[PDB]
Amino acid sequence: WVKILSVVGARPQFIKAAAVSRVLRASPGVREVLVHTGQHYDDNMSQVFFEELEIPDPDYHLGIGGGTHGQNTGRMLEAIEGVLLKEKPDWVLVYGNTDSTLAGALAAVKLHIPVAHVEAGLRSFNRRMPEEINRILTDHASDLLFAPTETAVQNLLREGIPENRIHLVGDVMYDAALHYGAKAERKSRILERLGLQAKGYVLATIHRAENTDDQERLRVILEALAEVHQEVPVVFPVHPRTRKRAEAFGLGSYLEKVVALEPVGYLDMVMLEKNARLIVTDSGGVQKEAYFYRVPCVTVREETEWVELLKAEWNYLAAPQNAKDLALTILHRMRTKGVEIDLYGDGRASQKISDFLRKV
Amino acid sequence: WVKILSVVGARPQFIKAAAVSRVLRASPGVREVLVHTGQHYDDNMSQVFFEELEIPDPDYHLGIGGGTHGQNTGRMLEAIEGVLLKEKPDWVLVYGNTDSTLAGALAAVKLHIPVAHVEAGLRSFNRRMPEEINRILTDHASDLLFAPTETAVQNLLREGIPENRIHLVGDVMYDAALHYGAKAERKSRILERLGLQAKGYVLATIHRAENTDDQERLRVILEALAEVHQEVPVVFPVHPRTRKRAEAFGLGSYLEKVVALEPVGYLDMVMLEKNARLIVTDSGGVQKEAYFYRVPCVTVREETEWVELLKAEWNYLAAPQNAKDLALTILHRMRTKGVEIDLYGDGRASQKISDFLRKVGI
Ligand SMILES: CC(=O)N[C@H]1[C@@H](OP(=O)(O)OP(=O)(O)OC[C@H]2O[C@@H](n3ccc(=O)[nH]c3=O)[C@H](O)[C@@H]2O)O[C@H](C(=O)O)[C@@H](O)[C@@H]1NC(C)=O
Ligand SMILES: CC(=O)N[C@H]1[C@@H](OP(=O)(O)OP(=O)(O)OC[C@H]2O[C@@H](n3ccc(=O)[nH]c3=O)[C@H](O)[C@@H]2O)O[C@H](C(=O)O)[C@@H](O)[C@@H]1NC(C)=O
Ligand SMILES: O=c1ccn([C@@H]2O[C@H](COP(=O)(O)OP(=O)(O)O)[C@@H](O)[C@H]2O)c(=O)[nH]1
Ligand SMILES: O=c1ccn([C@@H]2O[C@H](COP(=O)(O)OP(=O)(O)O)[C@@H](O)[C@H]2O)c(=O)[nH]1
Ligand SMILES: [Cl-]
Ligand SMILES: [Cl-]
């Protein structure tokens, strides 16, 4: 009998936790407690993932969201701690690299509760980025580090973290892709409702703060996607912050010139990803998923944490400096492909994690 | 020209800030803002330090204290971010390794405000200590790391922190002792008041969570000091956390078997330290201060961050497993001296810090 308490806050964490929860569910002598920090609150950012991915209802929802870093983090720290004091888990699992992730780790470590980091050791090497700080501080607060890549392992060793607390387990998001592919296949009619042809479109997601808070970068991107749309339709589930920023800066018309959508659930997303001729993104999960389905990817950033995708030629960096340049880069890359290679493990990262926990 | 905001919360942070602030006041094109988190709030833990050490009143008093790690840290995080969004300083200075330190660094780093850590790189290698977490995360959040010892430099290098963000400046608490030494001698009457001669007592402080939150460890300590007291008087300024714990555990009667005091001010503390035959402590700062005055030290812990003191034989660990043994260790070490050696620098650590903050560049 071991109690594993998972802290999730964001869309990409709900998806990671869905792979790990399934395994821990069906593990003998494990009880899972699941805390939702409230970081993502809208149904199309949260509840749709609990439904379609068959994720047990949270034991707690802390309903903390939409504030500053200080506010969100500070309140998550107090609220999570209150729950940890009540539930007394053997392990706390935190996922990815949001304020939720860091609050979870920090609440736990002060209570002497072992912390494991699912997706550990990724580095952008840009310490100005809030997500890089969250990655570093979470890894340094954690007791176990579940690395998805060799790079991530080397990143952790370089910062003095001992071999014996690092387990290279692959990526749980590959697990989720594998497990949920069939259900996506039978439930999603998004190509239908969108009148899209398999391989008859490009899929875009953009929501990095460094791309959306900056008017000139955001303009370069929305201009580039509208141009690209002249040649091949662009489907664009628009993050809510991205949509806020584009409206605020007067760039809302570029959204009208492509096939812009509200955020979609995981099953639609899998189907849009699978059937895309090419994926343009600044998302971590989406750039790996592009590779899952062997769709060429362009990453609209100056760097990625997922360097093996660049080495394998499945992914290509295009910083948003020039709208025409960005447009051509996207159009050129859609008739490329990368090498045959298996990354991210066998789709059993979650049971490797289960195993290492109930042992350690 | 440049605005530098210090975050402080607890006694040892007001002493460190005293030393640094004095220098920054002399520096041209340097405005300071001091945020007192409210972590320490009793007058004998906060106000007395501002007064005797000549520190200007805090620009802000957040009045946070007395909660859990979660509550204190969380509330401090949100509150400090508020001040920073108003003040928009060029630097945030954080000190040591309390919950206030961490909350200061976390508030700042997410606002893209450069953080410098005064007293960076110390490691106990014991994560159960909240303090060990606070200094790991603070160091990893910081843009400048003011390390007091080579060990601390080596700690930071080992954790992947680049050499160009690390500066070995020595310890601003040596600067503090050096600068306030004459004032303490001139003004303190604590010896007169207690009726102590020089070398006629042992000084004790205890306040680690690991020593006070555990009934039987605390009993071991209080009992050991009572025994020591029978052979050489024990003076014991008692931390409010320690008193509170001693009371709740029913251990208060032990404090009557030594010369138990409320916390004393820095000036009185110098005089007590300086004239003690031996210091026994679980304090960080008191360990170094014992060495400043060449008084043997016993550290009632399983480890210290100040390892150089063990190597020079000025300090000795004595984890509290047994009262008889701990007493005997204390009495035995009263007769010892370390090796002559200069540590902690030249007493101008603050000047080095000031210089780096000014010349670091945008
Ligand atoms: C740059 C960065 O730090 N990123 C971190 C960030 O993730 P991320 O950038 O992937 O955000 P995100 O794109 O919202 O999610 C994608 C998922 O949403 C699905 N997705 C996407 C759009 C959509 O409409 N519907 C949908 O189902 C996709 O199919 C996909 O499964 O938060 C993550 C977390 O803390 O767990 C970190 O692991 C990441 N760190 C890394 C290193 O990749
Ligand atoms: C073990 C540990 O983590 N310790 C950390 C902790 O300090 P510390 O353990 O020294 O607490 P503490 O003993 O209350 O203060 C001593 C001072 O009070 C004076 N003092 C003491 C008693 C008294 O009655 N009067 C008086 O003036 C003394 O004369 C002396 O100058 O908080 C510090 C901070 O965050 O800045 C960190 O730098 C420390 N890290 C280290 C590594 O030493
Ligand atoms: O359900 C949600 C979640 C987020 N957002 C918007 O997205 C922003 C960024 O949210 P997030 O929690 O992802 O912040 P990050 O982790 O990127 O700092 C929020 O301030 C909101 O404007 C929203 O509108 N609805
Ligand atoms: O001026 C003060 C500061 C603290 N405390 C008590 O000491 C405890 C510990 O304070 P803190 O969390 O700052 O830790 P510490 O001072 O022991 O490092 C608090 O919870 C209070 O009960 C007090 O009585 N007076
Ligand atoms: Cl998105
Ligand atoms: Cl004390």
Side-chain angles (χ1 to χ4, degrees), chain B residues 11 205-207 237 239:
Chain B
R11 170 171 65 189
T205 75
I206 299 297
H207 77 274
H239 199 284

Side-chain angles (χ1 to χ4, degrees), chain B residues 11-13 15-16 49 95-98 101 119 122 129 131 135 173 205 207-208 237 263-266 269 273 283-286 289 301 305-306:
Chain B
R11 170 171 65 189
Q13 296 174 342
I15 300 168
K16 291 175 190 60
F49 292 101
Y95 296 86
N97 49 246
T98 66
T101 311
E119 207 196 77
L122 279 311
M129 276 167 82
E131 24 286 292
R135 56 204 170 230
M173 296 183 72
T205 75
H207 77 274
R208 294 266 67 79
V264 303
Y266 188 68
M269 194 56 181
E273 295 171 327
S283 166
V286 172
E289 290 163 2
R301 295 176 67 201
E305 304 76 12
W306 301 104

